[PDB]
Amino acid sequence: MFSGFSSFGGGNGFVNMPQTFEEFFRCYPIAMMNDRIRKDDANFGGKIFLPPSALSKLSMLNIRYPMLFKLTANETGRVTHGGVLEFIAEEGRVYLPQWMMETLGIQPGSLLQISSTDVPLGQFVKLEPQSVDFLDISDPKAVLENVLRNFSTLTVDDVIEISYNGKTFKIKILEVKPESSSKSICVIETDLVTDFAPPVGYVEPDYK
């Protein structure tokens, strides 16, 4: 009968719907690519090459930049989240790092599916450290930030590796606090918090 005509809060009770886009392209092993025509960082990075045709379609869908891409493998049934650099293949070519191919469980010439997904940026991410040497760095936090920049999308199930000074480090997202059931975390700038927790009970003797 009577209405207060007043609204209080209600924002918390609102759930944001992620953005999902699907694309199909053929992937090729970047490893076979000549070093001269390829970048070393790209080989160990999480950036992939896609056609401009897909990007144009995304704009129509009003996808905010940066754009996130997700890889789907029918053969393994597992889907990893890959990052995107720039579109240079007019015909429609997809390139991925050698390590990524192993995770996807697909061999050269295999089809690769890329879907655009947008996440509200997780709040907490748990990363698995490797070797005490990694934690021996004066500014380990800085290294982490660099890794996030390299990878547009981060998945708990996906294992990301960073190569520094010719060295490769394995970082595994054991557990993260997400805002969606997708169980995917992607931090563009720095809205994601990372913590290092030593899961290895082995100790290496000091050499002197």
Curated annotation (Swiss-Prot):
Q: Which domain of life is it from?
A: Eukaryota
According to its UniProt entry, one GO biological process term is: cytoplasm protein quality control by the ubiquitin-proteasome system
Q: Which residues form a coiled coil?
A: none
Instruction: Write out the GO MF terms.
Output: polyubiquitin modification-dependent protein binding; ubiquitin binding
Q: Does the keyword Nucleotide-binding apply?
A: no
Positions of the site: Monoubiquitin-binding? 37, 39, 109
**Similarity section:** Belongs to the UFD1 family.
Q: How does it assemble?
A: Component of the heterotrimeric CDC48-NPL4-UFD1 ATPase complex. The CDC48-NPL4-UFD1 ATPase complex interacts with the HRD1 ubiquitin ligase complex composed of the E3 ligase HRD1, its cofactors HRD3, USA1 and DER1, substrate recruiting factor YOS9 and CDC48-binding protein UBX2. Interaction between the complexes is mediated by interaction between CDC48-NPL4-UFD1 complex member CDC48 and HRD1 complex member UBX2. Forms a complex composed of CDC48, NPL4, UFD1, DOA1, SHP1 and deubiquitinase OTU1. Interacts with NPL4, CDC48 and UBX2.
Q: What is this protein called?
A: Ubiquitin fusion degradation protein 1
Native organism is Saccharomyces cerevisiae (strain ATCC 204508 / S288c)
- Which gene is this protein's source? UFD1
Q: Which residues of the full protein are shown?
A: 1 to 208 of 361
